[PDB]
Amino acid sequence: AKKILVTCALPYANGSIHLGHMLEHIQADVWVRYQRMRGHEVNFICADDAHGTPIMLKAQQLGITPEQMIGEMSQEHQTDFAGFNISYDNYHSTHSEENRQLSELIYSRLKENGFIKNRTISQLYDPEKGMFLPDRFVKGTCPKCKSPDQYGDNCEVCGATYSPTELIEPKSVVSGATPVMRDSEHFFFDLPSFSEMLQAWTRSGALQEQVANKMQEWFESGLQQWDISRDAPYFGFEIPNAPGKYFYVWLDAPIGYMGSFKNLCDKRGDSVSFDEYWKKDSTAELYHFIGKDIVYFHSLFWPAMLEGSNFRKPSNLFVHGYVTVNGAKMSKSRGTFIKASTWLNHFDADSLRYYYTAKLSSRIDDIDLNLEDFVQRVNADIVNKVVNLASRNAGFINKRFDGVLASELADPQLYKTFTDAAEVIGEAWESREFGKAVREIMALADLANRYVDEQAPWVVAKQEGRDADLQAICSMGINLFRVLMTYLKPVLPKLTERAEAFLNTELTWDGIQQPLLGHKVNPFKALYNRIDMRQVEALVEASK
Numbered sequence: 063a064k065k066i067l068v069t070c071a072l073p074y075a076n077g078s079i080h081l082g083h084m085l086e087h088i089q090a091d092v093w094v095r096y097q098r099m100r101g102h103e104v105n106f107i108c109a110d111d112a113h114g115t116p117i118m119l120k121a122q123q124l125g126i127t128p129e130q131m132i133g134e135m136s137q138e139h140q141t142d143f144a145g146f147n148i149s150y151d152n153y154h155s156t157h158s159e160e161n162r163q164l165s166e167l168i169y170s171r172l173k174e175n176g177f178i179k180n181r182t183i184s185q186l187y188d189p190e191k192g193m194f195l196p197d198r199f200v201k202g203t204c205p206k207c208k209s210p211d212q213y214g215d216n217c218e219v220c221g222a223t224y225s226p227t228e229l230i231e232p233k234s235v236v237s238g239a240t241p242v243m244r245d246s247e248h249f250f251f252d253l254p255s256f257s258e259m260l261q262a263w264t265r266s267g268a269l270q271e272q273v274a275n276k277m278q279e280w281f282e283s284g285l286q287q288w289d290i291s292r293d294a295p296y297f298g299f300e301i302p303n304a305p306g307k308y309f310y311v312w313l314d315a316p317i318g319y320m321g322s323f324k325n326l327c328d329k330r331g332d333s334v335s336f337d338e339y340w341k342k343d344s345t346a347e348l349y350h351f352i353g354k355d356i357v358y359f360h361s362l363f364w365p366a367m368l369e370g371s372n373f374r375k376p377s378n379l380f381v382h383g384y385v386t387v388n389g390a391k392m393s394k395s396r397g398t399f400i401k402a403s404t405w406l407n408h409f410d411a412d413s414l415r416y417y418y419t420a421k422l423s424s425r426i427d428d429i430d431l432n433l434e435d436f437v438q439r440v441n442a443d444i445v446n447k448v449v450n451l452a453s454r455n456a457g458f459i460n461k462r463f464d465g466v467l468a469s470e471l472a473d474p475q476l477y478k479t480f481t482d483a484a485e486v487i488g489e490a491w492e493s494r495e496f497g498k499a500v501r502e503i504m505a506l507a508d509l510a511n512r513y514v515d516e517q518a519p520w521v522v523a524k525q526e527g528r529d530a531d532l533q534a535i536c537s538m539g540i541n542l543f544r545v546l547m548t549y550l551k552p553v554l555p556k557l558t559e560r561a562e563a564f565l566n567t568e569l570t571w572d573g574i575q576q577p578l579l580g581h582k583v584n585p586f587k588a589l590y591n592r593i594d595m596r597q598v599e600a601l602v603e604a605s606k
């Protein structure tokens with residue numbers, strides 16, 4: 063049995079969970095659930111990313127402490143993820159004592175090992191508020207076209223890009239004061255020292271080909287030292303021996319993966335597992351599910367930080383593309399920027415889990431939630447292919463056979479075709495070829511419904527003396543359903559619970575080798591109802 067630690071990217075504490083987050087957390091959860099079904103020791107770890115200037119300023123605007131604000135959003139996030147049945151073993155915070163101690167430890171080791179440099183830089187500073195301004199907190203007049211009220215390093219009228227130091231009549235977004243250039247000592251992590259190590263990782267064949275190709279572009283451009291400090295005022299961890307300096311959020315954020323695992327171990331009273339998973343000699347596997355926009359941090363800075371502080375590196379990064387809705391980036395004006403909480407007011411979690419899983423693969427590709435296709439595909443595949451095998455057969459079993467399935471399989475050869483597919487389906491889940499797994503499962507569902515059609519139970523049921531035939535046919539259909547629901551168990555947790563209640567058995571991967579024979583099933587009310595476009599229209603309207 064493998065030991066596996068899986069993470070999803072840590073959501074920022076200053077925004078609600080939306081469908082883009084859900085693509086990532088669902089992808090990881092399906093994989094995790096499959097790994098658990100195969101008997102491995104799995105630790106699925108996440109946390110909120112709770113530090114930084116935007117969070118500090120948002121709390122001040124609200125008139126509450128950053129601690130109060132991040133606590134409220136942590137609860138909101140966890141409520142939403144729980145509503146999608148994301149099965150974390152721990153959900154922590156980057157604002158935690160575990161992360162503080164690990165961040166200080168890693169920094170101290172990097173510094174002792176020669177990988178931290180000090181250099182003075184010049185940056186725009188708000189002298190009224192008394193703080194350095196990140197680019198997006200500077201506004202002013204575009205130097206090229208002279209359009210007013212442009213933010214940061216680009217103009218939204220003419221498209222020009224420039225340093226915010228080129229803005230005409232610049233103003234602080236925080237206070238309205240004119241910012242000025244001011245010097246400050248910063249601490250830099252010497253990423254270039256790890257170039258050769260990182261290039262060897264890129265060539266090893268572990269990473270997605272598309273990621274390795276992108277890393278070659280980054281090596282070609284040239285790795286640079288990374289500014290890992292920020293001046294007070296800041297919401298984050300103060301740097302030891304450097305009063306008024308804090309770790310930049312992105313230094314502490316991936317350390318939060320470690321902090322969340324440490325927290326889990328400590329709450330369990332487990333004094334051995336942290337080192338077993340994070341020491342250089344670990345035989346455990348470490349996987350990060352992440353999106354395209356944060357690959358640089360996870361493929362360059364993070365393995366280098368770990369190497370330089372005597373910790374093991376990720377076994378692999380699993381990168382996914384962006385979500386689109388109706389083919390386009392989510393759009394607030396069109397009502398396609400959809401929050402996870404809003405989704406659940408209109409649809410169940412399983413429907414979105416299924417739809418995303420049917421489109422996901424081991425490559426980086428944007429995943430399109432086409433809302434018309436969502437209705438058609440959920441209805442066709444879940445209602446009319448898979449659940450249909452239970453719903454068309456269970457009534458006869460309950461009403462005419464006292465709930466008891468036949469004592470032998472009617473078609474053992476067909477059953478073996480279903481169980482023989484377990485190897486290819488499992489390998490598809492394992493390899494993250496989720497769309498392939500779904501295609502194989504739905505091809506089997508088509509075969510199962512073809513079998514039932516060929517036996518014509520709606521004819522058999524009306525014909526004198528054919529009770530045994532009817533029980534045989536319907537039991538066969540229910541056994542095929544048992545197998546398909548096992549293959550779909552990582553994808554559809556709530557439907558699976560309903561199926562397990564009907565079948566009076568827990569679904570296990572190996573259990574499909576023993577069909578249900580001479581076995582009592584329970585009645586059910588609909589396992590899964592149809593959806594329609596009126597519900598989609600309501601979701602979109604509610605999201606505007």
Ligand code: MET
Nearest residue numbers: 071072073074111315316
């Ligand atoms: C250590 S992963 C941090 C991810 C970051 N909060 C983001 O949402 O992009």
Ligand SMILES: [Zn+2]
Nearest residue numbers: 204207217220
């Ligand atoms: Zn302009």
